[PDB]
Amino acid sequence: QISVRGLAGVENVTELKKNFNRHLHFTLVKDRNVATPRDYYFALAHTVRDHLVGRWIRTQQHYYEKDPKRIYYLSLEFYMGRTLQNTMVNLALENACDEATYQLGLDMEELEEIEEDAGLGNGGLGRLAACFLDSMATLGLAAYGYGIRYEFGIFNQKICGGWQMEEADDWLRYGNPWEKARPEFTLPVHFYGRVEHTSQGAKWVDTQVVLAMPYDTPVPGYRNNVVNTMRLWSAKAPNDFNLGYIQAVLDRNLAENISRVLYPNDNFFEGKELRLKQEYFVVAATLQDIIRRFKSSTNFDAFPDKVAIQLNDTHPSLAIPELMRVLVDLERLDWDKAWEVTVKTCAYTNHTVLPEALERWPVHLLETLLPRHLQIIYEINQRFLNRVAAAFPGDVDRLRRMSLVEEGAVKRINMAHLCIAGSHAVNGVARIHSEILKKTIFKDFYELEPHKFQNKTNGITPRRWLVLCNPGLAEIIAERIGEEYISDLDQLRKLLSYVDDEAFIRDVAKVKQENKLKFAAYLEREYKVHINPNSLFDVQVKRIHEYKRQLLNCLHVITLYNRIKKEPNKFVVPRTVMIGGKAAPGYHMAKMIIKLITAIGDVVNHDPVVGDRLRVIFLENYRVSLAEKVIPAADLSEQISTAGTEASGTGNMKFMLNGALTIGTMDGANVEMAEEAGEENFFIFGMRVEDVDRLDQRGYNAQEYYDRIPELRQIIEQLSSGFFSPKQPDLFKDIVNMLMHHDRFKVFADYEEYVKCQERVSALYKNPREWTRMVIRNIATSGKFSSDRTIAQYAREIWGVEPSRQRLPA
Ligand SMILES: OC[C@H]1O[C@@H](n2cc(-c3cccc4ccccc34)nn2)[C@H](O)[C@@H](O)[C@@H]1O
Numbered sequence: 001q002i003s004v005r006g007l008a009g010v011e012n013v014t015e016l017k018k019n020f021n022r023h024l025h026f027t028l029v030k031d032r033n034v035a036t037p038r039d040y041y042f043a044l045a046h047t048v049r050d051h052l053v054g055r056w057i058r059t060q061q062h063y064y065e066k067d068p069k070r071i072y073y074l075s076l077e078f079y080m081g082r083t084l085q086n087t088m089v090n091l092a093l094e095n096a097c098d099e100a101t102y103q104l105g106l107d108m109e110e111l112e113e114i115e116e117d118a119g120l121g122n123g124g125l126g127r128l129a130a131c132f133l134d135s136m137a138t139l140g141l142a143a144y145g146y147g148i149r150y151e152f153g154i155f156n157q158k159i160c161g162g163w164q165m166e167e168a169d170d171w172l173r174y175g176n177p178w179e180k181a182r183p184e185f186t187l188p189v190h191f192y193g194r195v196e197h198t199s200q201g202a203k204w205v206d207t208q209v210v211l212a213m214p215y216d217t218p219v220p221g222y223r224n225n226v227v228n229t230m231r232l233w234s235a236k237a238p239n240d241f242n243l244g245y246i247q248a249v250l251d252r253n254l255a256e257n258i259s260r261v262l263y264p265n266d267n268f269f270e271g272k273e274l275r276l277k278q279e280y281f282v283v284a285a286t287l288q289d290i291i292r293r294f295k296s297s298t299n300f301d302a303f304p305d306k307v308a309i310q311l312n313d314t315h316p317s318l319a320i321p322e323l324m325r326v327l328v329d330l331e332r333l334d335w336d337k338a339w340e341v342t343v344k345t346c347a348y349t350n351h352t353v354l355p356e357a358l359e360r361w362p363v364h365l366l367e368t369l370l371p372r373h374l375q376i377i378y379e380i381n382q383r384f385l386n387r388v389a390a391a392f393p394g395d396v397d398r399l400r401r402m403s404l405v406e407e408g409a410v411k412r413i414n415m416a417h418l419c420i421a422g423s424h425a426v427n428g429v430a431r432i433h434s435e436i437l438k439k440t441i442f443k444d445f446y447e448l449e450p451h452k453f454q455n456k457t458n459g460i461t462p463r464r465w466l467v468l469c470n471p472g473l474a475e476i477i478a479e480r481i482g483e484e485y486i487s488d489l490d491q492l493r494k495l496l497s498y499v500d501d502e503a504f505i506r507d508v509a510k511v512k513q514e515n516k517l518k519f520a521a522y523l524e525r526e527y528k529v530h531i532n533p534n535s536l537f538d539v540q541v542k543r544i545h546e547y548k549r550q551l552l553n554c555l556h557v558i559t560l561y562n563r564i565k566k567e568p569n570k571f572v573v574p575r576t577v578m579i580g581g582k583a584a585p586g587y588h589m590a591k592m593i594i595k596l597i598t599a600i601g602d603v604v605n606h607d608p609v610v611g612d613r614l615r616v617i618f619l620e621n622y623r624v625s626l627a628e629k630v631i632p633a634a635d636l637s638e639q640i641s642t643a644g645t646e647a648s649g650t651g652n653m654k655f656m657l658n659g660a661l662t663i664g665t666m667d668g669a670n671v672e673m674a675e676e677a678g679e680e681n682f683f684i685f686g687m688r689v690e691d692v693d694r695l696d697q698r699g700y701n702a703q704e705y706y707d708r709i710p711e712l713r714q715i716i717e718q719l720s721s722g723f724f725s726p727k728q729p730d731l732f733k734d735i736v737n738m739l740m741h742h743d744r745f746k747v748f749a750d751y752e753e754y755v756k757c758q759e760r761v762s763a764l765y766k767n768p769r770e771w772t773r774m775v776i777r778n779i780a781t782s783g784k785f786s787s788d789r790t791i792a793q794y795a796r797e798i799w800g801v802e803p804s805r806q807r808l809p810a
Pocket residue numbers: 122123124125126128265266267268351352354356357429458646647648649650668
């Protein structure tokens with residue numbers, strides 16, 4: 001049908017049709033008479049999967065023969081979403097499979113909707129890992145994703161009476177056709193025990209053993225025949241575990257609970273023992289596998305020349321003392337050589353400056369669970385503080401600030417300090433975030449070792465985030481500039497010469513309208529809610545957190561409603577305001593914000609005076625596959641975090657690529673986005689980081705804003721008096737109290753500029769042609785934000801490897 005989706009050749013369609021019928025019969029044990037739509041999806045999944053295997057076997061064979069430097073991306077989260085359409089896209093099978101299934105009398109899009117998201121992540125940090133795997137394969141790097149195969153991913157979010165309810169995400173219920181179990185690579189992981197000192201070094205004895213069984217998922221590059229591996233560990237009890245008899249067998253679940261469920265915290269460091277076990281489990285199993293593969297290529301001097309380990313936050317930070325443990329205790333290298341290998345192998349990426357997010361493990365926990373690693377950490381710290389003392393003589397406070405061991409009520413290990421000390425490179429995820437790291441939380445470390453500190457601005461994959469989710473836009477772009485931009489997103493600059501092109505202007509606008517119509521229908525068909533597709537689609541989608549200021553959005557929405565009620569017969573640009581995201585189950589305020597949003601909607605959506613001029617919708621169960629639907633449909637992207645709090649953002653980049661304009665603060669990657677597009681083409685408002693600092697020194701007094709802004713006072717009075725909760729007048733007392741007395745993120749301080757800037761958005765929207773030309777200027781300058789660029793920078797400046805766009809033989 002459309003060009004970017006590949007050729008539908010006669011030979012291919014015939015072959016796909018027959019393999020589909022073979023799988024339906026032989027693999028699913030069905031015929032067309034009793035086959036469910038789920039069987040049809042599975043037959044298609046198996047057909048497409050067959051096209052991966054040849055390439056997967058010869059990519060891994062290629063890496064054995066060539067022996068390149070291997071990249072190991074260690075993460076507790078891989079937010080993958082669905083695999084079927086992405087596989088077709090990267091293999092150029094999409095039109096062919098579409099045609100083949102059409103001829104079989106099936107609708108492929110309906111079949112695609114049956115696949116469960118692999119929801120093995122919470123939000124931005126997990127999705128980054130997934131975009132990274134895609135870019136690494138596309139750039140022909142010998143890269144492996146390593147994580148945990150959770151039985152249950154992020155919870156499915158249900159909204160009942162306006163409240164979030166969580167339910168278990170049983171994503172493996174019907175089976176996962178994309179994974180291949182590799183039980184021949186099952187590995188032992190040790191916990192507890194104690195340390196014995198012999199004549200010949202320390203020994204870790206009396207341990208409990210949990211087995212780690214790997215499951216391999218293919219990661220196909222874009223049209224280059226490269227298929228890399230994401231290896232995920234599953235916990236298994238050994239067969240003599242606890243071995244009355246029945247209880248012993250039932251108790252096996254204690255060991256296997258390690259890989260049962262993803263921790264759903266996007267907010268507040270929870271020092272739970274099960275989480276620590278998860279962190280060590282993935283680290284211990286991965287390092288054994290890395291070393292095994294290294295040996296199967298004695299000499300550990302060359303180890304860093306053949307191995308790079310990237311740590312996705314501090315979650316796999318135990319890789320540092322674990323590598324030391326293996327090298328010193330098992331391989332009998334001396335400390336200094338082992339440490340040199342470790343530093344040169346490891347690199348650390350930070351994703352937040354919020355103090356409550358930092359991992360600070362109680363010493364008594366590491367004492368019990370990992371006695372040897374605690375000893376190694378103490379030795380690391382001692383030798384590190386000796387270096388600090390020699391560089392800054394007499395600076396006793398610097399020593400205690402930089403210590404990996406924090407003294408207090410309970411002694412803690414600071415895992416971020418561990419990571420910096422044990423890594424040859426430390427990076428932030430956007431230029432401003434990376435500067436904030438050097439100036440504030442890691443200032444002392446930067447002064448000691450300035451060369452370790454880097455920036456690597458985040459990116460998103462244009463395969464999933466344009467071609468897959470927005471074929472219409474990819475096609476009109478391809479019509480003018482060809483197809484090469486899909487793996488070379490900088491080529492989108494060539495679209496700047498079409499900004500005054502009347503045909504292109506009309507096409508860009510047409511595609512958006514089609515996307516909005518399709519999404520407006522999806523809402524009714526799946527959720528029975530009626531929206532006006534001619535309104536401006538104002539969308540804020542991301543995890544619910546106070547720093548992200550969904551509450552500032554709420555205040556604007558209430559302002560618009562009150563202004564309508566004040567002057568009913570005045571014209572206003574119609575808006576559909578969509579807010580979506582999950583709240584961490586124990587985050588009370590985040591759960592209150594969800595309830596506020598639905599409560600606002602209850603009032604706004606049923607006011608006869610309002611009509612269809614304003615709608616407030618809460619997007620339930622936001623996740624990767626819903627993002628693929630709503631993002632192409634958006635006109636306005638809300639990126640309104642308090643300056644200095646959003647490390648980068650990646651949702652922002654998705655919206656920019658898909659033809660939405662951005663309203664945002666100068667925070668994270670918004671700064672670089674505005675810089676690329678030009679500030680005239682961006683809706684910037686609010687305090688800069690400097691302004692936040694000034695307010696903090698003086699003291700933030702919310703009351704001042706309440707007293708001086710009559711429209712704000714009215715909103716707070718409506719919330720307090722029970723205007724949005726008639727049966728429970730004091731329901732939102734917590735929200736008001738927080739806003740008035742302990743708002744860390746200064747919601748009121750940005751309110752005036754925000755509302756004013758929102759008016760400028762509505763003004764532009766009244767002029768479709770000038771709205772669309774500004775959109776073109778955004779899409780055209782979005783090229784920097786491809787994770788292909790990000791990964792090439794990691795590759796060259798951290799890992800020491802050269803990317804390749806060359807095909808492997810088919
Ligand atoms: O680098 C990729 C993205 O990572 C995001 N992120 C941060 C976190 C995160 C994990 C664990 C605890 C956290 C606590 C507070 C804020 C974020 C947390 N999860 N995702 C960052 O919040 C976002 O700015 C960035 O674009």
